Amino acid sequence: MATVKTTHRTIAGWDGTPLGAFVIEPQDAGGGRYPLLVMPSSWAVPSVEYVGVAQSLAQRGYVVISYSSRGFWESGGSIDIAGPSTVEDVSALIDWALDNTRADPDRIGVSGISYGAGTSLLAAARDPRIKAVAALSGWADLQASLYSNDTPSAQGIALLVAAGLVTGRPGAELATINRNVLAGNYQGAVDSLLPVAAQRSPAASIDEINANQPAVFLANAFNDSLFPPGQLVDFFNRLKGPKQLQLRHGDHALNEALGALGIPNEVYDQVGDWFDHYLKAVANGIDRQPAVQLKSQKGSWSSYPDWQATSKGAVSYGLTAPSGLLLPTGGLAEHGGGTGWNYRIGSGLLTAANSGVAMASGALQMINLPPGAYVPFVGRSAAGVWQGPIQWSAKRLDGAPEVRLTVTPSRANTTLYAYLYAEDVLGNGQLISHKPYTLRGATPGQAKTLDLRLEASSWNLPAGSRLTLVVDTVDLRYAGISQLGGAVTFTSPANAPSVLKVPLH
Numbered sequence: 001m002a003t004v005k006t007t008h009r010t011i012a013g014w015d016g017t018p019l020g021a022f023v024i025e026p027q028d029a030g031g032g033r034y035p036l037l038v039m040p041s042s043w044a045v046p047s048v049e050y051v052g053v054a055q056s057l058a059q060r061g062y063v064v065i066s067y068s069s070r071g072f073w074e075s076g077g078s079i080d081i082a083g084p085s086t087v088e089d090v091s092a093l094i095d096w097a098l099d100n101t102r103a104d105p106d107r108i109g110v111s112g113i114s115y116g117a118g119t120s121l122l123a124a125a126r127d128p129r130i131k132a133v134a135a136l137s138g139w140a141d142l143q144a145s146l147y148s149n150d151t152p153s154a155q156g157i158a159l160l161v162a163a164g165l166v167t168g169r170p171g172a173e174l175a176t177i178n179r180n181v182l183a184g185n186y187q188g189a190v191d192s193l194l195p196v197a198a199q200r201s202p203a204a205s206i207d208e209i210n211a212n213q214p215a216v217f218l219a220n221a222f223n224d225s226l227f228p229p230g231q232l233v234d235f236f237n238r239l240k241g242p243k244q245l246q247l248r249h250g251d252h253a254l255n256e257a258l259g260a261l262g263i264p265n266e267v268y269d270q271v272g273d274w275f276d277h278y279l280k281a282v283a284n285g286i287d288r289q290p291a292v293q294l295k296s297q298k299g300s301w302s303s304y305p306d307w308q309a310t311s312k313g314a315v316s317y318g319l320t321a322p323s324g325l326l327l328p329t330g331g332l333a334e335h336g337g338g339t340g341w342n343y344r345i346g347s348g349l350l351t352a353a354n355s356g357v358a359m360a361s362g363a364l365q366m367i368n369l370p371p372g373a374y375v376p377f378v379g380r381s382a383a384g385v386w387q388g389p390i391q392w393s394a395k396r397l398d399g400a401p402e403v404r405l406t407v408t409p410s411r412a413n414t415t416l417y418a419y420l421y422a423e424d425v426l427g428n429g430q431l432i433s434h435k436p437y438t439l440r441g442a443t444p445g446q447a448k449t450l451d452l453r454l455e456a457s458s459w460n461l462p463a464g465s466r467l468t469l470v471v472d473t474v475d476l477r478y479a480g481i482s483q484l485g486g487a488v489t490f491t492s493p494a495n496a497p498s499v500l501k502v503p504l505h
Contacts, residue, residue, distance in 0.1 A: 002026035013089040020074030021067035024058040035107035035279035040116035043163040078171035090123035125205035139227035140235030151436035152186035186479035213241040215278040221250030248295040250367035262367035294458035310399030319498040332388035348484035349382035370431040383472035399503030415480030
């Protein structure tokens with residue numbers, strides 16, 4: 001193991017903006033060049049040790065530049081939300097390192113978390129010297145993350161604002177978001193960002209990254225508060241070069257470098273092995289590992305050669321018409337359901353089915369811990385509820401469930417939320433996955449068939465439990481546009497039956 005020297009200094013960005021940086025260099029001995037890692041730090045969250053993580057990588061035998069981006073307290077400039085300047089600064093710091101350290105120009109990598117993860121991926125698209133990327137808790141599509149199916153993520157946008165405010169000085173884009181969020185104008189925040197979001201989205205540079213063919217490692221939490229997994233998976237799937245995706249359930253750990261971000265120590269252990277293989281040619285077998293690796297809520301791993309394999313043999317459950325004397329409830333019926341039925345709910349009514357709890361003012365929790373929902377208390381005039389059978393043996397859900405549903409709104413503006421729960425014998429539901437869907441400017445009384453892809457998950461369903469689908473019209477974490485007084489009618493036309501597809505293993 002290398003012992004490393006850490007030196008603080010100011011390094012000029014692309015336009016001269018001074019960036020606060022820790023330059024970490026292997027000592028010992030005489031004394032060839034080392035692979036270089038440039039690592040943009042992320043949000044300033046108390047207890048989070050970005051430099052420490054960088055030093056531990058450097059001790060594997062790397063020159064590492066750990067640095068604060070433009071606008072951070074320790075730098076000049078303004079936070080531009082991983083804008084073109086922030087991304088170009090990655091290249092400027094690569095140039096500086098090559099000229100001022102024992103860095104090998106033929107073995108360059110980038111790694112970051114959240115702010116630094118999106119920054120790192122964009123740099124890999126724009127700088128073909130980069131041969132490997134390790135991006136943690138990051139995004140591919142900023143619009144899809146904050147404005148999923150045209151539904152603003154109120155709690156996601158608020159967290160973006162809160163994180164920015166403790167990290168540095170906002171540029172105009174972030175200041176406009178901040179002003180909108182203060183008024184409760186989440187839609188206005190979105191509207192302000194959309195015209196400049198694509199240039200901040202790795203997904204918009206998929207061709208450029210595929211051309212450059214870096215080795216891309218992605219590791220996120222299913223329950224990331226800012227950047228949900230589907231938009232990451234979609235990007236991952238389109239990469240043509242060496243790649244690995246890991247998804248885990250996040251929880252807070254104490255007394256770890258990254259525990260307050262919900263990231264366990266094991267992630268940067270795997271990152272190390274990734275870089276060691278691709279940049280130092282260590283034969284550690286990383287190259288033979290499955291491209292998709294998933295860690296369930298009980299902490300056990302599964303793997304797949306690609307994302308398509310997660311959906312192999314998915315079960316199609318037909319939705320049946322809700323029935324019952326007191327608690328109208330439908331079925332999830334494996335080959336198959338009913339067609340020709342209708343079931344009307346009121347829009348804008350509150351249920352216990354929520355993706356998250358109300359969060360404090362300025363809270364910096366980077367993962368989300370959804371509340372349980374007691375299914376018998378989910379108001380049937382406010383929600384459609386469909387229950388599958390109680391399983392007598394354990395099963396494992398790996399992948400993204402899909403719901404096809406036909407809906408008829410009485411108002412022009414409605415937001416729908418679909419939830420998949422593991423419901424125990426007594427009726428206690430644990431949320432596995434959800435998805436929002438906003439219908440804006442719809443024609444009242446016209447039935448529309450919608451396909452919702454629920455967020456990717458990995459879930460051990462125990463014996464004694466069933467899968468339960470809830471669809472309602474309000475969620476505490478999103479700025480939905482449903483109105484009390486309106487209605488939604490669920491149907492299942494013979495032509496296009498209402499069906500939940502679930503990737504069980």
